[PDB]
RNA sequence: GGGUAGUUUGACUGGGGCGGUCGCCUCCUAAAGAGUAACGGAGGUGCGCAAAGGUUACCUUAGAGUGGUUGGAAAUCACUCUGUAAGUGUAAAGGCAUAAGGUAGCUUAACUGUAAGACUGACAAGUCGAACAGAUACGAAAGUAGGUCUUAGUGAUCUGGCGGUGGCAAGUGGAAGCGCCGUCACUUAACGAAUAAAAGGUACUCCGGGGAUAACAGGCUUAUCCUUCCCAAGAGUUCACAUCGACGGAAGGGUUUGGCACCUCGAUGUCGGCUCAUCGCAUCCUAGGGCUGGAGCAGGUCCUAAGGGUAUGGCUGUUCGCCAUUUAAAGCGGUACGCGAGCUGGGUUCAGAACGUCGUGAGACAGUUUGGUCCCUAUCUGCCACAAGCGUUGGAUAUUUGAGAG
RNA sequence: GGGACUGACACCUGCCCGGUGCUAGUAAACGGCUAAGGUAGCCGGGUAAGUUCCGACGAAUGGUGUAACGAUUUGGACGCUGUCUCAACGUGGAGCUCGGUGAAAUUGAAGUAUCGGUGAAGAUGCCGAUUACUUGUGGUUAGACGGAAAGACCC
RNA sequence: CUCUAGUCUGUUUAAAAAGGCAGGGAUGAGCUGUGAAUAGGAGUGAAAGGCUAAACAAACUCGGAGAUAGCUGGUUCUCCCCGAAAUGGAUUUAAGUUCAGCCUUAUUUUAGUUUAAUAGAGGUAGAGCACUAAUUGAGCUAGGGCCUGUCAAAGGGUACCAAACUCAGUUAAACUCCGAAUGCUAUUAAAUGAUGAAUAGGAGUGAGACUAUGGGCGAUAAGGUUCAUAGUCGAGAGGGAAACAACCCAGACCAACAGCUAAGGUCUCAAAAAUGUGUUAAGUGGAAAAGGAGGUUUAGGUACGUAAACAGCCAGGAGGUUGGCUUAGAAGCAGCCAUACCUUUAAAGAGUGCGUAAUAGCUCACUGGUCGAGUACUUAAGCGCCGAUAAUGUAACGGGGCUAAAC
């Protein structure tokens, strides 16, 4: 998995996440990107499922960059309890994504194969996506 | 049908059931009011056309400072910066005509 | 498994007590603070707990120098 | 000295109990004055210091790089870069280059009588404070000093003790005692403290009330549960999709276990069984199909379809489950987990008794076994049937077309 | 004579004096088993099919057997049967009609229909829609969160 | 003659504890008549918290006594004026009570509040990486490990584990080099007329709820819990949302068979509309996800063309060469490397699919004719389709109905 190896505080308050993305919204390290069309949370584990999909589809053609790291605990109270004590315990990790986050970046392979692989990745994420070529190079 | 969804739906339908003709009348009134307010140092007659019930506390205080307590209230005021600011605050609830 | 914590002190009501430009007479408290968030300028004094108070009647004013705020009576 | 009598044994609590907590300080939550809840998320604390205080004077780290017996990455020293990230008794925050950091000398203001004018505040309280008088300390002097860089280190009133002062002195004069000033003795920590002095059970219970507060149901949500769907890496000899479809994603159903405490405590009778059904289709079988790694037969998967049918016994109070014979097949759910003003009381959920365990005991235990009242003549609505009156346009007597319904 | 304990009878009834009672001792005392760690003893059959039953904790608040006894509890067998598949018929007292006498609890009233919805969140009274000539009697309780008992359970 | 296991009737019964069937005792711890003795914190009890005049976890009567209740219920004629709170602090307090705040009466006093200008302090949103932390790809490089002429000496290769450093790109309520918009505070001038303040008298409240926003907790679930701003109900009639305290419009002194309007509508039920330009064929309208998808309107790109584009049809679709092999067999089609194999080149891929043990064979991409201009793949916006699915009866426009009477 993907998860931070040390935290100042184990639990943090669930904010309201809203607005488009004003940063991390441009293709930087690669050729093709997987932008999101929603604002939501992507778990670490869906992240690695999409990463397997892309990497396995790509027969050594190129490289894959993951532009999000979860670093947000998601707590869940024990199964059968009431509303009493408080802030149960970390269960899994979430990453925040907003409308316009690049979220995934690919290098090396032909555009057709990249589009296929990256629809194969989008099939496993909880948000609508769009595949973008640099739109300023080819 | 689940109550959460039906309440959301009923509210959305009520909100969306507004008439474009009424909206156009309101837009025309707003344009007229802004045009009048854009002037400077004229006597303007202010009618109150929307009630005070349910509005914000600050805006009720502004209207009572202008002198309007009821719908159908008539007050003549001399446009300076103070009155211009009050009118801008409460533009959506007034009708401005000009006193030649 | 109850809550390990839940403990808070009484709020101390710090902050600026007289706003810049207000008229004060001798001995007024202007700022309550921990530490010199605001430093002392002309005609004011600093208490043992960094309170800012007015040594004479006048009008409060805040100035800024090198990024530090100074309180004075003019 | 429970032989006997009078009493105590707290509250908050997402029911109660158990558990945990109760004063105060620092930060966030706290939405840019202040203030602002929670069993929200993180720490410290019921002190220490005669210097770690006051005053005067004089000084600046940590880290990186480089060169040096021990000495290595790192001990001490020199220099370059860096300019407070170092250090401030003690937690953290706000601050501290004029350093509030460090060193040295002197010294006790770690004072008395006081106080203009304020902040914070229900009150009681708490905090800042120029400046005045006396006596100083330090410095040449101006000035500073009414403890600790600031922000926690704390406790009212009553009662009692000690010291000082000499006001009160019940006929007078002494004295006792008291007032005044200084001041000590409360984990009164349930910390604005009901007593100087305090534990449990009640299923033998009782009273006054509450749906302000639990258990069976109603209602909300869907964590959980169940039924699908989207992507297809593979398996399937080769063949992603005959079939199974790994790792994920998006929804419905409101039946399981729960959340919440909205209806109900001047009573909504709780689990099964018997009798009586009805409805949904997500179809157990009979019916009509598509495709198969479907030869036929027997299947598997999928679509449409609720008209009818969908078993009897042994065990268990049992729902469920298991087992034995069957049948074309022995479906899944809703309806107060259908149906007690229809029946049954086996179990659950009274008072008996015994056993296991815990408690010194009284007793407690969804631990076990046995015994242990199921009330009410139907007013209306509803339904199963039979009549009275009346209409159907002249009034009656017979034979019938047929809406509609079973 | 008084009190406690055990409970015909048969075989046994062991260990521990720290604690608490009683007068260092006493356990056939309260009790335990470091004061002392408990001594003796305590799958098969039945049925086509058996969560039941039968056969393989603890020692004087007693352990293990026992003839006889019991309106005690549980299992199995024989006989017998309307308990059941499965009900039908008959008899007697009510119920039914008429005559005489004549209540009760309950009761804001009422020219009180149903379904789908909404709502102090299960509608006789509201919305929409549907059904229905008027009024009784004999039956049956689905409802009126029925009546009766200021819930006994929880707080 | 005395008792009551089991079962039944009865249970607004004949009986406030029987009766109908049955059972136990029945010469004894026996039944029973007639007198007497034991009285309430006591008696009695072959021992069940039993009984003691039909009721006993402390009898009954009288008196104290009209005991005390933070608990519940009730509290009777009218009109006019003003008008709450459900918050904070404390409490053997949490269903109470008290102070403040809020309200009213009377007197005195006169400057609330809303702006505009001007002058003030933030760290919130946002933003950002200088600080504290998290963290991605490269460059660079200590150190450590491995390997290599290595004895544990001095050496080298670095596939790595990696401090620090450089470039680029990210996370943070308890990080902030920066920082709003509002709000808060002061002054002045206008504007609004008893809304301020003080004293005195008298209360009530100290259970809130919902909506529009900012939050925490829960599961970015709940008509859930708990805070901040404002409104509403509470304490507010009327109109509208089919019915529907909290939403929308709107503050009822009284009367009128007057008019103009807000919200909301104008086919009818049921007071009110028509004309113009487009879309919709799904009754969408008149519920909803991801996804699938030659639906269609409009607009904009990439492929492509009057020198013959797409589709169909008529032919070619080759050879060197089983491409090299792996393998037992791969001839284009178990599988591996690539097709940096040229050639006659119409045009022909180290062959697209089916099927062959392996081939064969049948076809495709490509190309030539026929015919004759849009075709072939995407993007943006407006309506659509499947997805779409629970139980008393069509039941997700109020209904009739509507192709506009929809948008």
From Swiss-Prot, chain A:
Region annotation (Disordered) ranges: 1-21
Molecular function, one GO term: structural constituent of ribosome
InterPro entries xrefs: Ribosomal_uL16, Ribosomal_uL16_bact-type, Ribosomal_uL16_CS, Ribosomal_uL16_dom, Ribosomal_uL16_sf
Keyword Heme in record: no
Keyword vocabulary terms for this entry: Ribonucleoprotein, Ribosomal protein, RNA-binding, rRNA-binding, tRNA-binding
Biased composition (Basic residues): 1-15
Entry keyword RNA-binding: yes
One of the record's GO cellular component terms: cytosolic large ribosomal subunit
SUPFAM superfamilies to which the protein is assigned, alphabetical: Ribosomal protein L16p/L10e (SSF54686)
Gene3D superfamilies: Ribosomal protein L10e/L16
HAMAP family, alphabetized: Ribosomal_uL16
Family the UniProt entry places it in: Belongs to the universal ribosomal protein uL16 family.
Subunit text: Part of the 50S ribosomal subunit.
Functional summary from the UniProt entry: Binds 23S rRNA and is also seen to make contacts with the A and possibly P site tRNAs.
Protein name: Large ribosomal subunit protein uL16
Organism (species): Borreliella burgdorferi (strain ATCC 35210 / DSM 4680 / CIP 102532 / B31) (Borrelia burgdorferi)
Curated annotation (Swiss-Prot), chain C:
Region (Disordered): 1-13
Keyword Repeat annotated: no
Protein name per its UniProtKB record: Large ribosomal subunit protein bL27
Organism in which the protein naturally occurs: Borreliella burgdorferi (strain ATCC 35210 / DSM 4680 / CIP 102532 / B31)
One Gene Ontology term, aspect cellular component: cytosolic large ribosomal subunit
A Gene Ontology molecular function term of the record: structural constituent of ribosome
Pfam family, any one: Ribosomal_L27
GO biological process: translation
TM region(s), chain numbering: none
Classification via InterPro entries: Ribosomal_bL27, Ribosomal_bL27_CS
Coiled-coil ranges (or none): none
Disulfide cross-links: none
Family named by the database record: Belongs to the bacterial ribosomal protein bL27 family.
UniProt keyword annotations, A-Z: Ribonucleoprotein, Ribosomal protein
Source domain of life: Bacteria
């Amino acid at each position: 998995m993907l998860s931070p190896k040390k935290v100042k505080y184990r639990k943090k308050q669930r904010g309201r996440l809203s607005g488009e993305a004003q940063k991390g919204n441009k293709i930087s390290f690669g050729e093709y990107g997987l932008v999101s069309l929603e604002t939501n949370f992507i778990t670490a584990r869906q992240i690695e499922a999409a990463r397997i999909a892309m990497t396995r589809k790509i027969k050594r053609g190129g490289r894959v960059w993951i532009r999000i790291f979860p670093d947000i605990p998601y707590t869940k109270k024990p199964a059968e309890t009431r509303m009493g004590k408080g802030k149960g315990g970390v269960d899994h990790w979430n990453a925040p994504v907003k409308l316009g986050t690049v979220m995934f970046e690919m290098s090396g392979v032909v555009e057709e194969l990249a589009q296929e692989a990256m629809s194969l990745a989008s099939s496993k994420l909880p948000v609508k996506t769009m595949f973008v070529v640099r739109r300023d190079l080819r | 049908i689940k109550r959460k969804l039906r309440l959301q739906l009923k509210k959305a339908r009520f909100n969306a059931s507004r008439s474009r003709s009424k909206n156009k009348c309101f837009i025309k009134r707003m344009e007229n009011n802004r045009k009048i307010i854009s002037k400077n140092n004229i006597n303007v007659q202010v009618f109150l056309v929307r009630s005070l019930i349910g509005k914000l506390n600050k805006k009720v205080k502004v209207l009572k400072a202008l002198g309007l307590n009821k719908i159908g209230d008539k007050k003549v005021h001399f446009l300076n910066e103070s009155i211009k600011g009050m009118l801008n605050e409460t533009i959506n609830m007034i009708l401005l005509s000009e006193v030649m | 498994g109850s809550s390990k914590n839940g403990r808070d002190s009484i709020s101390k009501r710090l902050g600026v007590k007289r706003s810049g430009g207000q008229f004060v007479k001798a001995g007024e408290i202007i700022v309550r603070q921990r530490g010199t968030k605001f430093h002392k300028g002309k005609n004011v004094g600093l208490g043992r707990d960094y309170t800012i108070f007015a040594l004479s009647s006048g009008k409060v004013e805040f100035k800024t120098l090198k990024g530090r705020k100074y309180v004075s009576i003019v």
